[PDB]
Amino acid sequence: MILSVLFSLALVSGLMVVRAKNPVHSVLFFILVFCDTSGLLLLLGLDFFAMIFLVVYIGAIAVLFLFVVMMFHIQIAEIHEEVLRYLPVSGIIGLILWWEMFFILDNETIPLLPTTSLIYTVYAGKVRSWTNLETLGNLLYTYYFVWFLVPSLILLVAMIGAIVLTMHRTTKVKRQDVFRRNAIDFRRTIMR
Amino acid sequence: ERVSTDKHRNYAVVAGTITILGALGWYLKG
Amino acid sequence: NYTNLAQVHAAENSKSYDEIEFEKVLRKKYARKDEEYDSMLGVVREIPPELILPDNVLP
Amino acid sequence: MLEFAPICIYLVISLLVSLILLGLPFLFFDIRFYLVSILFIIFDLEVTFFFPWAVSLNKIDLFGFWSMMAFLLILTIGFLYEWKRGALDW
Amino acid sequence: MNTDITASTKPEYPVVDRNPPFTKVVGNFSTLDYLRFVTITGVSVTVGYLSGIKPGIRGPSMVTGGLIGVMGGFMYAYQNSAGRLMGFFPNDDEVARHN
Amino acid sequence: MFNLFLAVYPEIFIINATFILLIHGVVFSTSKKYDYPPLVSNVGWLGLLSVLITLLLLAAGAPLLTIAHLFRNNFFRRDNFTYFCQILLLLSTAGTISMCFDFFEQERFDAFEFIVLILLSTCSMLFMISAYDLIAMYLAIELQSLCFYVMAASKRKSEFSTEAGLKYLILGAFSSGILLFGCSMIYGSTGATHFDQLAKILTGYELAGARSSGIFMGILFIAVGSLFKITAVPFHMWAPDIYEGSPTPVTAFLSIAPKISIFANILRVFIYGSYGATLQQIFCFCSIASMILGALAAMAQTKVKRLLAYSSIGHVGYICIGFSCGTIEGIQSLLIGIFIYALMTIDAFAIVLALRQTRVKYIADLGALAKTNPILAITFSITMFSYVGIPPLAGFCSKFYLFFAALGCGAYFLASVGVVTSVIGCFYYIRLVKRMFFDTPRTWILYEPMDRDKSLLLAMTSSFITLFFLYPSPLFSVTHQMALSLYL
Amino acid sequence: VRVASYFAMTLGAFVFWQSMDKVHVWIALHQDEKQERLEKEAEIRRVREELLK
Amino acid sequence: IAVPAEILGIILPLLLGVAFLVLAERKVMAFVQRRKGPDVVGSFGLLQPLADGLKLILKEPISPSSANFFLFRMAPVATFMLSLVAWAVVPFDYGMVLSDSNIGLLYLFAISSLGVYGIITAGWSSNSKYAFLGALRSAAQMVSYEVSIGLILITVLICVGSCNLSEIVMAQKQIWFGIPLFPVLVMFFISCLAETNRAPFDLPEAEAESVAGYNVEYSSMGFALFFLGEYANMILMSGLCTSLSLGGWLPILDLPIFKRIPGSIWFSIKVILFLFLYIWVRAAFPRYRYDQLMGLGWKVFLPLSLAWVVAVSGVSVTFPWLP
Amino acid sequence: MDLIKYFTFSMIIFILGIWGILLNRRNILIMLMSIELMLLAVNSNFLVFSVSLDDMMGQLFALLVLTVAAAESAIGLAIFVITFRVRGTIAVEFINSIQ
Amino acid sequence: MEKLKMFVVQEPVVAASCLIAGFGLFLPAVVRPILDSYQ
Numbered sequence A: 001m002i003l004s005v006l007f008s009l010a011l012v013s014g015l016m017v018v019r020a021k022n023p024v025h026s027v028l029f030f031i032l033v034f035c036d037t038s039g040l041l042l043l044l045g046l047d048f049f050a051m052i053f054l055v056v057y058i059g060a061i062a063v064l065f066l067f068v069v070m071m072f073h074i075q076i077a078e079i080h081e082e083v084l085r086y087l088p089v090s091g092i093i094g095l096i097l098w099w100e101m102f103f104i105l106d107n108e109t110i111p112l113l114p115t116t117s118l119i120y121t122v123y124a125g126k127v128r129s130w131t132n133l134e135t136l137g138n139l140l141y142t143y144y145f146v147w148f149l150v151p152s153l154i155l156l157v158a159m160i161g162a163i164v165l166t167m168h169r170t171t172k173v174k175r176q177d178v179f180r181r182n183a184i185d186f187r188r189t190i191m192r
Numbered sequence B: 001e002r003v004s005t006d007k008h009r010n011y012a013v014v015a016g017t018i019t020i021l022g023a024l025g026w027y028l029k030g
Numbered sequence C: 001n002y003t004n005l006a007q008v009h010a011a012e013n014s015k016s017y018d019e020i021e022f023e024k025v026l027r028k029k030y031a032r033k034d035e036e037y038d039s040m041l042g043v044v045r046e047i048p049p050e051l052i053l054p055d056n057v058l059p
Numbered sequence D: 001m002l003e004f005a006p007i008c009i010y011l012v013i014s015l016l017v018s019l020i021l022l023g024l025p026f027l028f029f030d031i032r033f034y035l036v037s038i039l040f041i042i043f044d045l046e047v048t049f050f051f052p053w054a055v056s057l058n059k060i061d062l063f064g065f066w067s068m069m070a071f072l073l074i075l076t077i078g079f080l081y082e083w084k085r086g087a088l089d090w
Numbered sequence E: 001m002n003t004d005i006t007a008s009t010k011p012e013y014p015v016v017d018r019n020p021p022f023t024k025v026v027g028n029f030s031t032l033d034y035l036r037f038v039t040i041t042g043v044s045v046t047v048g049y050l051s052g053i054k055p056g057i058r059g060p061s062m063v064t065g066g067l068i069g070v071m072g073g074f075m076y077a078y079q080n081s082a083g084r085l086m087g088f089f090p091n092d093d094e095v096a097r098h099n
Numbered sequence F: 001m002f003n004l005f006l007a008v009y010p011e012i013f014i015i016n017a018t019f020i021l022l023i024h025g026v027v028f029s030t031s032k033k034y035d036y037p038p039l040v041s042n043v044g045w046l047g048l049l050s051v052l053i054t055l056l057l058l059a060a061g062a063p064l065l066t067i068a069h070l071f072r073n074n075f076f077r078r079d080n081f082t083y084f085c086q087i088l089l090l091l092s093t094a095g096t097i098s099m100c101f102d103f104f105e106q107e108r109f110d111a112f113e114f115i116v117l118i119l120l121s122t123c124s125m126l127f128m129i130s131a132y133d134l135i136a137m138y139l140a141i142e143l144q145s146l147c148f149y150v151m152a153a154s155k156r157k158s159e160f161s162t163e164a165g166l167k168y169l170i171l172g173a174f175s176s177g178i179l180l181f182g183c184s185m186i187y188g189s190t191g192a193t194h195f196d197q198l199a200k201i202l203t204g205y206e207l208a209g210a211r212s213s214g215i216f217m218g219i220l221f222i223a224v225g226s227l228f229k230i231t232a233v234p235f236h237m238w239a240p241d242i243y244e245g246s247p248t249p250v251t252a253f254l255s256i257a258p259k260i261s262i263f264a265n266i267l268r269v270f271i272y273g274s275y276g277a278t279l280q281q282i283f284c285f286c287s288i289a290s291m292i293l294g295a296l297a298a299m300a301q302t303k304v305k306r307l308l309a310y311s312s313i314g315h316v317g318y319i320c321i322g323f324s325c326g327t328i329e330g331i332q333s334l335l336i337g338i339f340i341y342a343l344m345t346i347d348a349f350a351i352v353l354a355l356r357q358t359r360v361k362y363i364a365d366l367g368a369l370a371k372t373n374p375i376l377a378i379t380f381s382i383t384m385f386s387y388v389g390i391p392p393l394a395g396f397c398s399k400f401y402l403f404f405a406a407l408g409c410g411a412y413f414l415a416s417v418g419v420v421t422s423v424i425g426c427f428y429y430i431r432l433v434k435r436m437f438f439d440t441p442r443t444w445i446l447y448e449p450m451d452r453d454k455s456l457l458l459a460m461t462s463s464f465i466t467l468f469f470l471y472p473s474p475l476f477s478v479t480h481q482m483a484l485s486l487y488l
Numbered sequence G: 001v002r003v004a005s006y007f008a009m010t011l012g013a014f015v016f017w018q019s020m021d022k023v024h025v026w027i028a029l030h031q032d033e034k035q036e037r038l039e040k041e042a043e044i045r046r047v048r049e050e051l052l053k
Numbered sequence H: 001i002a003v004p005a006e007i008l009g010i011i012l013p014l015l016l017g018v019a020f021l022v023l024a025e026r027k028v029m030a031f032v033q034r035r036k037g038p039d040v041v042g043s044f045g046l047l048q049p050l051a052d053g054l055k056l057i058l059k060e061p062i063s064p065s066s067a068n069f070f071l072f073r074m075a076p077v078a079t080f081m082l083s084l085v086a087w088a089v090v091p092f093d094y095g096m097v098l099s100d101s102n103i104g105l106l107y108l109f110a111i112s113s114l115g116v117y118g119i120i121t122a123g124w125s126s127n128s129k130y131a132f133l134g135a136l137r138s139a140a141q142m143v144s145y146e147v148s149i150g151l152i153l154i155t156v157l158i159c160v161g162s163c164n165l166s167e168i169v170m171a172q173k174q175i176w177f178g179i180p181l182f183p184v185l186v187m188f189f190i191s192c193l194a195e196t197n198r199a200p201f202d203l204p205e206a207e208a209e210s211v212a213g214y215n216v217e218y219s220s221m222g223f224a225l226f227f228l229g230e231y232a233n234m235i236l237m238s239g240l241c242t243s244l245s246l247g248g249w250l251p252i253l254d255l256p257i258f259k260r261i262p263g264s265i266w267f268s269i270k271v272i273l274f275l276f277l278y279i280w281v282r283a284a285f286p287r288y289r290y291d292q293l294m295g296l297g298w299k300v301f302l303p304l305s306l307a308w309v310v311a312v313s314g315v316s317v318t319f320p321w322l323p
Numbered sequence I: 001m002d003l004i005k006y007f008t009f010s011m012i013i014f015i016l017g018i019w020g021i022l023l024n025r026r027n028i029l030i031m032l033m034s035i036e037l038m039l040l041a042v043n044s045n046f047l048v049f050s051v052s053l054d055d056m057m058g059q060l061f062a063l064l065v066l067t068v069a070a071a072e073s074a075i076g077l078a079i080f081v082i083t084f085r086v087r088g089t090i091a092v093e094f095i096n097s098i099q
Numbered sequence J: 001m002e003k004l005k006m007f008v009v010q011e012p013v014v015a016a017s018c019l020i021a022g023f024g025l026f027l028p029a030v031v032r033p034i035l036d037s038y039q
């Protein structure tokens, strides 16, 4: 029930992202759907992944989108189009994708119909319960270090591109210097 | 009066002669 | 106007080897300019007075 | 989990008290911000990678420690690029 | 952390040692490996000098080329020495020395 | 350096050289002691040197790249196929770096970050060619994608460059999302990410059935992503616009280098792992569309860069017929076609950069070139005829061997469509040759001479193209060995 | 006011998700019949192949 | 059930503590400045927070009508939620936690990350562009110093194997981590000073100066909620400082006379010293320019935090000193 | 049932991103947002598949996809900023100079 | 040496961070193998 409420809220927030008139409202509903996905991760049991979704998606990427959207100051009728015309094609494509989801579910993943009393508890792996954070760190830093070092190159490329694209140093503006003599030693002087 | 006063150019010439000697030795020993 | 042009020509033609080489280097380096990288760096790259032709001979 | 239900109830109660506090009186451009945000993204990813490494230093050996050091060195070169280019200045 | 040195293709020459130490591989450097290192470093320094004339940084360009060439030449010499010492290359001289 | 890393000396050296070049360029370009020198030429020369050195490392250490087979098996596997693919990729990168030097000085494009991104993207393509997993594949693809985003949008104030960067951005992100969904579907329905595990699970059972519907969808979405990466007509709409908008060195690099890496990746993920007739049918349809619409659209084009983009799309369609046959001869034909197309594209873009001095934009601009620059006119006409597939030149070798693979393929429809397209698409190459040689325009566009860096490369490439029919045995044997070594 | 509309859309999404649960239950129930249909079709193909051979 | 009772017993005393914290800030600043703070509203001014709150409640509200009424009203609500839910995890003694999350540190880091949205929306929803610019500046400053704070958290996480504050303190049992990492504690204190826009790095409170702030347009209760959120965050980060670098509910030297004190008293005392340090630094120092503080955050504290992370990791890995 | 619900939600989010791209013709930032929604759906699918299959590869690759998505968002917003500065507007009809 | 002293004066914080990072990398690079050999 809580799962159903959570992804109902997520679907509504995503629909508001799609059909929101104001891009700022779009960013806010994007934040909301990220929060709902984090709640779904709590339900799944991936506390670390939910927290990092919050930190990165909610924090970093979403403040980036918010900053750029607000700083643009986009006006209406500059980004504005009637949605009724595209409703048939959107419905057809969504129906095709939903039918494909139907076919995928109908064969591989069969839902279970009603259980708790039949749960066999091993008790062997519970003596030292490894957390998701702990297991992920162990694996990612011992035995998959290449797939961890490669994203460092991706981040370096992103930083280099961001600088080479959005850098503009002031051509002629004075910059304060604190290393002056009066700041360093300041020998006292008089009129005499 | 009979000396080249460019340190960088002198180092470059030394490196070029070293390169030529190394390439010749590599060819002879290969 | 031709007196002024003669002054410019004499000033250009009375240069020794060192001045010719220096002005050739300056002209080659200032022949073409990039404004994107100059703006990124925070530089202007002003034309030197050596290559500034006197206004007496300019339209 | 089983510990985030108190967090959810705390959030609900915080909403209630904030709404009550609001309703009590009723009874009576610039690229520097973008660059800062990009640096935020990069260093959030850095800290996100630090967290599991810091937790699992006891299991990962010098191999893991030096892998993290190489990751930092790859990303610290980017920080030197930031410093020398002028992205850290305002 | 477990590490395996086994290669997919079998060496075509007798193997002095499968996983020689770094110091042993460095000490295995023959005159040919030194010539490799010297030639690569000199090529890099010359290229750096010839390319840094236009920007105006000849010393800095030679320094950068020197670091790049030292790294590349040392990597190439170490590669050749290790390939010889693991039997991947015609290691007649150190096979005779081992025998 | 512990002995496992013998398997990654080329990549490690190229990464360290990229870092050193970045540090040197920044520290001596932000220097007030000098006049803030344009370090693009120096950094490019040092990057070309680094590319040559890592090429030498990879070539000489042929058996040492296999060291630590099981240790690296999680991330990548190296063999003769990857060895030759990486050799060709390094050669193409070196040629692209060498032939774009004169663009820097004349066009004032003095950002050494371009060369830094060249090196980083080349390392990404190296990792991609070596890659043997669904994770390293995605990481390398995304690394080159970000590099190419920055490359296309490199000219900040240029409206064309910004628009091309935005378009390539959005469409590449869409393709990355689709490919990611495919990887997710395969992982969920298979339990495996390593290519060996996928092969073990998938062999013996067709992908068209009630079982493994999720596997089929994942494979199809990954194929869609790869097809976008190679500009097939169902997903080609980015190639012409970004190829035109991005600076000419950027579009030359985009047309030359990513093709071989993406196609080697496709061979290693599809021909080995998910080999099944449905994938070859998908690529058959994609090849039909690619050839037909490339010819049709290039007939209507009047700009050199757009015509080159559509020619690239058509030749990708031919590489796709070679793939969609998917046999030993089919894969050998694919490799032959990739090599020949890379050589011809290097030739054509070297000539274009040579004509970039006077800012050539339209096909008519190179009119009356048979008088001002005769030998250049003959060279470019030879390149155009090679693109056509005229026998004495190199392009025809790949052409007829693709058609032979298609005749032994059983795909008579595919071969007939390909040959009809070859006849149809000859017209715009012939129009180029007419513009150089036949027309007598009222006014002529005089073109400045070349640089030696482009001239030597152009002479070597033209000699290779013209005189390839005298000795194709080395390339044919190498490609046959690569195709055989794909499996055993 | 948009808060009421947002909550109405939330209730609509909840109803849609209960409908999705209903169709999932329907698919879980009606799977065996599809299985015998597929078995009959496979038997038809096998008989056709053996008659061709 | 008992969970709402515990939540109310955490929330209401937190509001009382925030009120008496602003009163204590006034008193300490006045005593620093050779004067006496609020002393006329009740004995020693103890009823001054009550009088201020009652006046704020009784003040008639005004509606800016900024065409963003919902976002204008809900931003202080958002920051108040964030402060409270951040306080939902901080321990006070052995077993005084609501959610004993194994990822408590990252939870607090995430909540601190979410804190910028209230100010950003407050600045945007306001009609004036000065408030929007001030909100952007404050958001960026909190961003930089939260990056630094996260690096300090990583240092502490290197020191202690676990990620929950209670087990962090149980490891603090020996040496309090402040003796080994006093410079790290100092950097964390300055970073949290710049995180809450308090002491130096005080942009929004420089209203008399040209920077203005994001609270200019806000009415009585909006301003009150923003102030309550800021001061609750101040107390929260003082508690974080004492749980990270002072051992939380742990006595000094483990003497048996010191163990008679419950331990919650110890945590409260340490938090009080940290709040006194907050007011001390605010009263004793001038404030930084925006560019100066941003450059200091991105060039002085980030490299030092990375270097300290590396140094602590190297010390712990080399020797058997690892948990 | 839980796996069915999670997979259905992820597929619905993917379709919703597709719908965002479809409907937002004159809006480009929302197209990028729909792409990011596709990325989020992919991450959720990987995480739920890892949980269901008791394998850690899904978590590793979801973390890597998060890093890549953050980097590509940084690059994309850089492109957006430079484009908007070049042409002074974000309207699509000003980004149709190539045809 | 003189240039190093000038740099340390002009930028003390970066020099301190570099020294701390150098110590942190130096402990496991040398002292850790030394202790491993000693054990």
Ligand SMILES: CCCCCCCCCCCCCCCCCC(=O)OC[C@H](COP(=O)([O-])OCC[N+](C)(C)C)OC(=O)CCCCCCCCCCCCCCCCC
Pocket (backbone or CB within 6 Å): A015, A016, A019, A020, A021, A022, G001, G002, G005, G008, G009, G010, G011, G012, G013, G015, G016, G019
């Ligand atoms: C026991 C059953 C009880 C009843 C249950 C059903 C209740 C009704 C559910 C449908 C929604 C009704 C309210 C719609 C309000 C729209 C307001 C509007 O124009 O907003 C503008 C916004 C655009 O933003 P905007 O910026 O223009 O906002 C302006 C908002 N107003 C008008 C209030 C000022 O439109 C949208 O966002 C598009 C919404 C489309 C409809 C989405 C509905 C929710 C999802 C439904 C899924 C399918 C449900 C049925 C399933 C059946 C079984 C398969």
